[PDB]
Amino acid sequence: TVRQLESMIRLSEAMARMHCCDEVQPKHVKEAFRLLNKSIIRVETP
Amino acid sequence: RIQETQAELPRGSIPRSLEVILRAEAVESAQAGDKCDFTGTLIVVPDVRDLSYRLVFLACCVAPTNPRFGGQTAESIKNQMTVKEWEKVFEMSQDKNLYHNLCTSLFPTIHGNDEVKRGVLLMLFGGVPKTTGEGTSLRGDINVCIVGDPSTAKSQFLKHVEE
Amino acid sequence: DLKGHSVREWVSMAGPRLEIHHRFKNFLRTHVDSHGHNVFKERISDMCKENRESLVVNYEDLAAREHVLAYFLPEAPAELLQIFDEAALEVVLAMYPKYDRITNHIHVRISHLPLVEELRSLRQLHLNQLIRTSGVVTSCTGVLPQLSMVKYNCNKCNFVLGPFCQSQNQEVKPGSCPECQSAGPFEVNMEETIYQNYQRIRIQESPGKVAAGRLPRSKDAILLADLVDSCKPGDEIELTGIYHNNYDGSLNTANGFPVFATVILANHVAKKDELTDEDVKMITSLSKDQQIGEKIFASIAPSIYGHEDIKRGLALALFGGEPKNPGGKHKVRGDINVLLCGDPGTAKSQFLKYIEKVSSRAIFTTGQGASAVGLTAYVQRHPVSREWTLEAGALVLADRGVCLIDEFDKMNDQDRTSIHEAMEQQSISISKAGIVTSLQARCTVIAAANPIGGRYDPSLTFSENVDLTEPIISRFDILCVVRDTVDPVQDEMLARFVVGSHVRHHPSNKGVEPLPQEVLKKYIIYAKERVHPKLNQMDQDKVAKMYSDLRKESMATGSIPITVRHIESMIRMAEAHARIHLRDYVIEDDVNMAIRVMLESFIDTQKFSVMRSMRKTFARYLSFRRDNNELLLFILKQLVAEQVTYQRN
Amino acid sequence: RKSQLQRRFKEFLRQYRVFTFKYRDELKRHYNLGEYWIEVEMEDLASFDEDLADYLYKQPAEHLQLLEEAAKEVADEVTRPRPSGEEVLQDIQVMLKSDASPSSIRSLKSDMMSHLVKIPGIIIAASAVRAKATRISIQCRSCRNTLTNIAMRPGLEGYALPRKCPLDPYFIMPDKCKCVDFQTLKLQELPDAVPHGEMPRHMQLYCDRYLCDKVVPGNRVTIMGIYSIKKFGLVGVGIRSSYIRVLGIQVDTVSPQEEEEFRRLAALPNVYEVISKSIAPSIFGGTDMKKAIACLLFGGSRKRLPDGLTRRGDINLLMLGDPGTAKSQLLKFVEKCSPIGVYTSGKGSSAAGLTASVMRDPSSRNFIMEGGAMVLADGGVVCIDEFDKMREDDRVAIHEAMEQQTISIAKAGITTTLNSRCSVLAAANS
DNA sequence: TTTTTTTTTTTTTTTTTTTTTTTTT
DNA sequence: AAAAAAAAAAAAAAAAAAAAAAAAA
Numbered sequence A: 001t002v003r004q005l006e007s008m009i010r011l012s013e014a015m016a017r018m019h020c021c022d023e024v025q026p027k028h029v030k031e032a033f034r035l036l037n038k039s040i041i042r043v044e045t046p
Numbered sequence B: 001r002i003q004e005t006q007a008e009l010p011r012g013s014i015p016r017s018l019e020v021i022l023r024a025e026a027v028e029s030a031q032a033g034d035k036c037d038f039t040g041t042l043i044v045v046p047d048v049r050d051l052s053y054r055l056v057f058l059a060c061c062v063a064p065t066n067p068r069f070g071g072q073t074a075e076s077i078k079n080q081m082t083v084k085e086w087e088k089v090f091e092m093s094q095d096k097n098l099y100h101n102l103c104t105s106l107f108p109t110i111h112g113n114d115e116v117k118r119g120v121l122l123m124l125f126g127g128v129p130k131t132t133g134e135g136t137s138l139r140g141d142i143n144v145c146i147v148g149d150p151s152t153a154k155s156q157f158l159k160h161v162e163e
Numbered sequence C: 001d002l003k004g005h006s007v008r009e010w011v012s013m014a015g016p017r018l019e020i021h022h023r024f025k026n027f028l029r030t031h032v033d034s035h036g037h038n039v040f041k042e043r044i045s046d047m048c049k050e051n052r053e054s055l056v057v058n059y060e061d062l063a064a065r066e067h068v069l070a071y072f073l074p075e076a077p078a079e080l081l082q083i084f085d086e087a088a089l090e091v092v093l094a095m096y097p098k099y100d101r102i103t104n105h106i107h108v109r110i111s112h113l114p115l116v117e118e119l120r121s122l123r124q125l126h127l128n129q130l131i132r133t134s135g136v137v138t139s140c141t142g143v144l145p146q147l148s149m150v151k152y153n154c155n156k157c158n159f160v161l162g163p164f165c166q167s168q169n170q171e172v173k174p175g176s177c178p179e180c181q182s183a184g185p186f187e188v189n190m191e192e193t194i195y196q197n198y199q200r201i202r203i204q205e206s207p208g209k210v211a212a213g214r215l216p217r218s219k220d221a222i223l224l225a226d227l228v229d230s231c232k233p234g235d236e237i238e239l240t241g242i243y244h245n246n247y248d249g250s251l252n253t254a255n256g257f258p259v260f261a262t263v264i265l266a267n268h269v270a271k272k273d274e275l276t277d278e279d280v281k282m283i284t285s286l287s288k289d290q291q292i293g294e295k296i297f298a299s300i301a302p303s304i305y306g307h308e309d310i311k312r313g314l315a316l317a318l319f320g321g322e323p324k325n326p327g328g329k330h331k332v333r334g335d336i337n338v339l340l341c342g343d344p345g346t347a348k349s350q351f352l353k354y355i356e357k358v359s360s361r362a363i364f365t366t367g368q369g370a371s372a373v374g375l376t377a378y379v380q381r382h383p384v385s386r387e388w389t390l391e392a393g394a395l396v397l398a399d400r401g402v403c404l405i406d407e408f409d410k411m412n413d414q415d416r417t418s419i420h421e422a423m424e425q426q427s428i429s430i431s432k433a434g435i436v437t438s439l440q441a442r443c444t445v446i447a448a449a450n451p452i453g454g455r456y457d458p459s460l461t462f463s464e465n466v467d468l469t470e471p472i473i474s475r476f477d478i479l480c481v482v483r484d485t486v487d488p489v490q491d492e493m494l495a496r497f498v499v500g501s502h503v504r505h506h507p508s509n510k511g512v513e514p515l516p517q518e519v520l521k522k523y524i525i526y527a528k529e530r531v532h533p534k535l536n537q538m539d540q541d542k543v544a545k546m547y548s549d550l551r552k553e554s555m556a557t558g559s560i561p562i563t564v565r566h567i568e569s570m571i572r573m574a575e576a577h578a579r580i581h582l583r584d585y586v587i588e589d590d591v592n593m594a595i596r597v598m599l600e601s602f603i604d605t606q607k608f609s610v611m612r613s614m615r616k617t618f619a620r621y622l623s624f625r626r627d628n629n630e631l632l633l634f635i636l637k638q639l640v641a642e643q644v645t646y647q648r649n
Numbered sequence D: 001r002k003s004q005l006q007r008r009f010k011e012f013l014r015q016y017r018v019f020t021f022k023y024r025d026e027l028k029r030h031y032n033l034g035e036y037w038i039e040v041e042m043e044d045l046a047s048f049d050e051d052l053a054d055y056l057y058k059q060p061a062e063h064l065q066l067l068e069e070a071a072k073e074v075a076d077e078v079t080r081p082r083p084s085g086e087e088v089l090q091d092i093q094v095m096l097k098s099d100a101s102p103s104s105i106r107s108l109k110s111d112m113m114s115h116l117v118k119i120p121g122i123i124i125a126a127s128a129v130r131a132k133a134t135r136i137s138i139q140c141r142s143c144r145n146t147l148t149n150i151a152m153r154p155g156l157e158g159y160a161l162p163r164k165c166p167l168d169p170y171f172i173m174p175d176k177c178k179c180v181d182f183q184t185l186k187l188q189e190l191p192d193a194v195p196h197g198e199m200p201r202h203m204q205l206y207c208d209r210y211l212c213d214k215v216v217p218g219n220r221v222t223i224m225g226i227y228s229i230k231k232f233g234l235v236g237v238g239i240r241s242s243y244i245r246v247l248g249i250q251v252d253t254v255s256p257q258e259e260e261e262f263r264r265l266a267a268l269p270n271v272y273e274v275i276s277k278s279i280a281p282s283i284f285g286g287t288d289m290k291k292a293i294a295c296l297l298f299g300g301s302r303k304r305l306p307d308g309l310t311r312r313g314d315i316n317l318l319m320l321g322d323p324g325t326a327k328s329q330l331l332k333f334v335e336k337c338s339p340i341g342v343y344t345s346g347k348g349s350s351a352a353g354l355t356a357s358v359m360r361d362p363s364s365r366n367f368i369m370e371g372g373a374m375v376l377a378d379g380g381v382v383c384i385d386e387f388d389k390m391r392e393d394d395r396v397a398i399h400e401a402m403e404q405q406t407i408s409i410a411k412a413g414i415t416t417t418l419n420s421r422c423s424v425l426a427a428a429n430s
Numbered sequence E: 001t002t003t004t005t006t007t008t009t010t011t012t013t014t015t016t017t018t019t020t021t022t023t024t025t
Numbered sequence F: 001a002a003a004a005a006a007a008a009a010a011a012a013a014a015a016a017a018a019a020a021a022a023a024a025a
């Protein structure tokens, strides 16, 4: 849901803070998106 | 009021608390939850007449037990540091692949689970809190949860973050 | 005039005392303005006209004109302020000689003090000085009457004793009565004594200002005889007062250190934050716009994208219907209760919070216990006031307003019973301790809830995919089924919306036109208070035929039927829509729009197959005021979504 | 002089007319009935002598004493001839009322102290009737002399014993001191008048001889009294808790002509039809249901056989139907029309249980009876909506009550059988 | 002898724990 | 039939408001 957009924005902000950057580059957004996508796991079933 | 540290606790004994007393200048240098070193004098306070005395510490100075900086806004923190500490901080800021370096260093004993390490690292940093024009508060601190089978090193992640 | 040995002692001497007195009088007379000639002239005029017995004095101008007096002010506030009161009294008498009959006293209030501190920064160095702080009022007692000019009554010789002025530091002790020279007990003489209002508040540091690893601090303040009721709990207030210490406060009691309590003798209060005229013209000016309905429907919760139908329903709920009780035996509520049931992440709580913000007498509560006030009434000693009070349920507090209930599907059994009682009989009956009473709560309930299982499934009727019994749902006039369906265009639009909001509210940077919120609430007030539409122009033929057709269709299928209460709700919504336009007479278009909304809700409450059945069967009714572009876009979106599903399966 | 004011009050009481002298005859009838109190309309006093009313509004404390003394003397003058054993004249409490709109509790500032104030509120607690001494006698311990008839002030104003006839040799004789009724109440601001975000304010009411127990907690009341502070041997400094001296109470919400009206109404040939069509005129249809509800309202007759067994005479009605029919509306009308009636849901109501419960106060160890809808509705009607959604305890309780008319409850403290003679009108869906 | 501070007592309420009870698998 | 969660009992602690007695000067 949209709360995942909020989480992605926050994760991009944190990623930017990690490098002490002053503007959120697209690479930070990509990394946050990748991490959040990995956090989601498929519900496998027979 | 303070209480004994965990390292000093003898076997099977509750921590001891002695209410220290602070005076001018150093009257708010200690906040709840901080580990602090108090320098001063132990004294007796009375609590025909009866002489009932209680021990109380009178501190002439309070400082953090494990100072973070050897020397709140970005520049203020920068000046709070020493020359060598700032050299290190600036060097690691320019350190490409600092993400993996932080992940490994923060959790050296936990094998794999790269995603959880990255999550808790971003958690330690966090986002940017903001306030809306209508007054709505935009959450700027990320929470994390860990769920799975036992002996997957969850409580170990929690203990790493705490310590 | 820097001279002498001690500032307070310097003012204590009669010489400089009278010098300051006359200099301050001359400052009041002479300090005019940059352009507002003699601000104090009209100031005193207005104060006397309304009998305000007070004078707010800016510190900037006083320092500019008389720097010596301004410098002396903060050092010894008591004496300087008393001298200022004495001066202003005779100044007022000179301006208004008759006003001497009113309060025989004038208070001087000082504002815009240059140096402002914080409650955590207060130190002994600030004792006995005028200090300006800021904080949140965390507690405030009643307007207690404090002795001002006591006249004790000697018991032995029944002779009333002269006025012993009451001091805020020490309780007055009478001597021996002059007549029979007895040092007896004495008792107050209330009939001949004169009092002064005494309120006690607590001011705590604003949470937004406290640092990370620190807790907010609080200080007790005393408001005296004119600042009373100037604050209520939860107010952010700038308080300028004397950091008084010497009244009785000294822990001389055993097991105590020679500490001193501190209270701020309040001298000025400024709250940092609707009966107007000629705004009736404003409201009427755009009332004739002929499209104001769309404007207002688009001017609800401007921070929420889309959900136009929900916004329309909330507008109708805000303006409300017309309560009517034919004779006295058929109570029909004029409210329009609304229930927003939807899968999470759809801004339902945002709608509820907006309604909280925009509507007067609007209170917010949650199904969980995380709300300040609960749904159910009770009696207990209030934790802060320690007084035994009847805590009326939240619904009662919103007696004539709006009650917002979040997590409507997570209430207790007693909470469910209380909401049922309030929605059914518009009142609450209490028999808890000994209070056998029935107090009425005529609230409009706007509720938010999530479907059972965290996702709304259209294959199931509304009443079964929500953790609410049929009687509860039967009392809501509008049911908004908010569904989060994957849609790339809408997803992109909402992402742009929220990300732009985040960008624009960063700390560093801190088809009609919606009405401004303040004007919107002014319009709501005027409409809700003045215009009372009467449905003398409703087409009974059309409504009756529509109801009969809906009955036949709903019973033709195994679906929830239409009942009389639906006609009631349509009537209420038509009256509300008329109220929006202030018509005073429901018009055919109002009735058609109300029918549109009611049928939309009733259809969306049905299962998937019945949804299409009633859509096609009553598409004419459901398409009123719905231009061709909207329907065509909906159909194109349906077709392209079908194509997408075929592609990706 | 004060004697002149009392004389003027006497003239007002003896000669105020409306012809007929209202207050003279009221004194006659009340004293003959033993009431020994009167209700003085403030507007009549103001019209007859406006100065007296203004004095009352400005100095109630002693002017009301003067009025009471004048009323006592007038009552003697109108009812002096009495049989032996009661000829002693009786003081008269003078309650006063007025049509002036009440002032919000928020306007009771310090200035209004000792003025006559009219405020609205809701009484949330009433203390038990007790004894306050109006005339006490003190006897010296050493000389055993007496100082009978020591006038005692009204209100929460104690009294200090004399020190000199040893020193402080006096003690009170309980058997010789005259006292009167006494009661303290808690008045909360009406919830409607409370500002939106704001706590409700409070006040303490003090009743007197005949004002005690004229109200019960939960009543919506208008109080006209003397804003007064406690007088008990004299960071807040010099703060005296304030209270109202209650003088007039008005509780907000059959003549023979009406008895004859009922007699002729019953005699009508179609009285049943007019009653049937006169219960839910707004509701359409259901004539048989309306007739049945009228029958339930009138009820049968309770019979107690010579053996002592009781046959209930109260009809119980149930209505099962689709949720569309106006049956909850019907229950609301029934509760609004029955002489004694209460509406409630299956699971009781909002903080008002269905059936009575008994609990013992651990501190005071009393037997507090928290009354449910059934016991409150004794002798009347209980309209239970959603009657099919009761709780097991309540289901059993109503199981017993609807037939026996009594709720039997036995707790760790005591056994008892509360009398709940209520007619149940139940609504339900399939 | 006369004040004063303490002493109690007498109510009342509040909080933690335990136990008892109700609902679900 | 048995376990999990909730509710109520009950006991201990705190506030406190007021009346009486012992110690002090």
Ligand SMILES: Nc1ncnc2c1ncn2[C@@H]1O[C@H](COP(=O)(O)OP(=O)(O)OP(=O)(O)O)[C@@H](O)[C@H]1O
Pocket: A002, A003, A006, C303, C304, C305, C306, C307, C343, C344, C345, C346, C347, C348, C349, C350, C449, C450, C494, C497, C498
């Ligand atoms: N239509 C929308 N327009 C703008 N912002 C939206 C919209 N829908 C959701 N959001 C945003 O997405 C987030 C989730 O919304 P919100 O927290 O109000 O959820 P909700 O509907 O109340 O959910 P729940 O039922 O879980 O409480 C918020 O930050 C909100 O601002």
Ligand SMILES: Nc1ncnc2c1ncn2[C@@H]1O[C@H](COP(=O)(O)OP(=O)(O)O)[C@@H](O)[C@H]1O
Pocket: B109, B110, B111, B112, B113, B149, B150, B151, B152, B153, B154, B155, B156, B157
């Ligand atoms: N991937 C791993 N790498 C290193 N140690 C691990 C790993 N998984 C489990 N362990 C070890 O297993 C032990 C128990 O794990 P623990 O965190 O207590 O399990 P749980 O998450 O159920 O509490 C820990 O002391 C940890 O050292």
Ligand SMILES: Nc1ncnc2c1ncn2[C@@H]1O[C@H](COP(=O)(O)OP(=O)(O)O)[C@@H](O)[C@H]1O
Pocket: C474, C563, C564, C565, C568, D282, D283, D284, D285, D322, D323, D324, D325, D326, D327, D328, D329, D330, D427
């Ligand atoms: N026969 C009728 N005559 C008048 N009004 C009716 C009739 N039937 C239903 N209504 C209206 O329909 C609404 C639903 O009635 P209600 O008693 O609430 O149903 P329920 O008892 O099932 O809750 C009521 O507001 C009532 O005014």
Ligand SMILES: [Mg+2]
Pocket: B154, B155
């Ligand atoms: Mg574990």
Ligand SMILES: [Mg+2]
Pocket: C348, C349, C406, C407, C448
């Ligand atoms: Mg929500």
Ligand SMILES: [Mg+2]
Pocket: C471, D323, D327, D328, D385
């Ligand atoms: Mg019903």
Ligand SMILES: [Zn+2]
Pocket: C154, C155, C156, C157, C158, C159, C177, C178, C179, C180, C181, C182
């Ligand atoms: Zn005297």
Ligand SMILES: [Zn+2]
Pocket: D140, D141, D142, D143, D144, D164, D165, D166, D169
């Ligand atoms: Zn004697």
